[PDB]
Amino acid sequence: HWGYGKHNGPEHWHKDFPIAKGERQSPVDIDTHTAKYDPSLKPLSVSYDQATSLRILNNGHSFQVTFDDSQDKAVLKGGPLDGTYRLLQFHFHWGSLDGQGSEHTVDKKKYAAELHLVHWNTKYGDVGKAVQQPDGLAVLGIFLKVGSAKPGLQKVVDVLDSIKTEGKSADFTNFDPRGLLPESLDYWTYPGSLTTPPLAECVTWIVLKEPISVSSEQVLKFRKLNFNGEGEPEELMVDNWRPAQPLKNRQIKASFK
Numbered sequence: 009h010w011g012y013g014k015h016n017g018p019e020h021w022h023k024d025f026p027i028a029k030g031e032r033q034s035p036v037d038i039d040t041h042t043a044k045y046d047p048s049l050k051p052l053s054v055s056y057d058q059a060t061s062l063r064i065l066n067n068g069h070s071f072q073v074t075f076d077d078s079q080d081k082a083v084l085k086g087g088p089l090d091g092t093y094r095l096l097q098f099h100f101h102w103g104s105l106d107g108q109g110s111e112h113t114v115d116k117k118k119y120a121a122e123l124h125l126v127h128w129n130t131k132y133g134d135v136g137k138a139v140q141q142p143d144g145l146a147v148l149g150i151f152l153k154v155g156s157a158k159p160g161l162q163k164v165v166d167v168l169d170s171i172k173t174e175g176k177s178a179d180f181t182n183f184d185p186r187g188l189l190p191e192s193l194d195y196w197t198y199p200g201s202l203t204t205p206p207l208a209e210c211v212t213w214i215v216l217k218e219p220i221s222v223s224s225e226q227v228l229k230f231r232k233l234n235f236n237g238e239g240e241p242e243e244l245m246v247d248n249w250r251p252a253q254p255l256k257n258r259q260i261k262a263s264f265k
C-alpha cells in the first residue's frame with residue numbers, strides 16, 4: 009500500500025500510479041516573483057453558510073471531515089472557476105517539526121501544515137466522475153503557521169483522541185468551516201493534480217496567500233494521530249506531505265499585485 013515511509017513514500021508512487029511523472033502534478037513551489045498578476049481573475053466566492061458536516065475519519069494518511077454534498081449547501085465559485093463547486097471534505101497535511109509539513113511551498117519556504125478544502129464541479133454530477141475531468145475539482149489550500157491559537161480549529165483538535173488509528177470515525181455535525189479561513193482571500197492558482205494517489209490531473213488549485221496561525225498545542229494534537237490501525241505497531245502520523253513537483257509547462261497566476 010502506498011504511504012509516506014522510506015519504502016512506500018512519494019518516490020515510489022510512480023510504480024503503481026505512473027501519472028506521478030505527468031505534466032500537471034501537484035504540489036509545486038510558488039515562486040512569488042515569477043507568478044503573474046492576472047487582472048481578469050475574479051474574487052473568490054466562498055458560500056459556506058449552509059454547510060452540513062457529517063463525520064470525521066482517520067483514513068490512514070490524514071484525517072478528514074466530510075460534508076453533505078447532495079445539494080448546493082457549501083459551494084465555491086468565482087476566482088478562476090467556471091460554474092459551481094460543492095464542498096465534499098477537508099483534511100490536512102503536516103510535519104514532525106514546525107519547519108515542514110506543507111505541500112505547496114512559497115519561495116521554497118515550507119509551512120508547518122496545509123489545509124485542503126476539496127470541492128467538485130457540479131456539472132459532472134458526482135465526485136467520481138469529476139476526478140476524470142481536467143476541470144473536475146477545485147482545492148482551496150491554506151497554509152498553517154505556528155503562533156496564536158485558531159479558535160475555529162479547536163473543535164477539530166478536541167475530537168482527534170477519538171480517531172487515533174486508521175479506520176476510526178466519529179460524528180462531527182454542526183462544524184462551521186468558515187472558522188478556518190484567513191482574513192484575505194487573495195490567491196495563486198494553477199492547474200494541477202491530487203497530491204495523493206491516484207494523483208489524478210483534475211484539480212484547479214487555489215492557494216491562499218495569507219496563512220492562518222495555530223498554536224503549538226493544536227499542531228501537537230495532529231502529531232499524536234497514528235498511521236497504523238488499532239492493534240498494530242505504532243507509527244505516528246507525521247510528515248504526510250508530498251514534496252514539490254516540476255512545474256513543467258505551467259504558469260502560476262496571482263489574483264493580487
Ligand SMILES: NS(=O)(=O)c1ccc(O)c(NC(=O)NCCCCO)c1
Nearest residue numbers: 124126147201202203204205206207
Ligand atoms: N491532497 S488533495 O490533492 O487535496 C486530494 C483531494 C481529494 C482526493 O480525493 C485526494 N486523494 C485521495 O483522497 N486518495 C485516497 C486513496 C484512494 C486512492 O486509490 C487528494
Ligand SMILES: [Zn+2]
Nearest residue numbers: 099101124203
Ligand atoms: Zn490534501
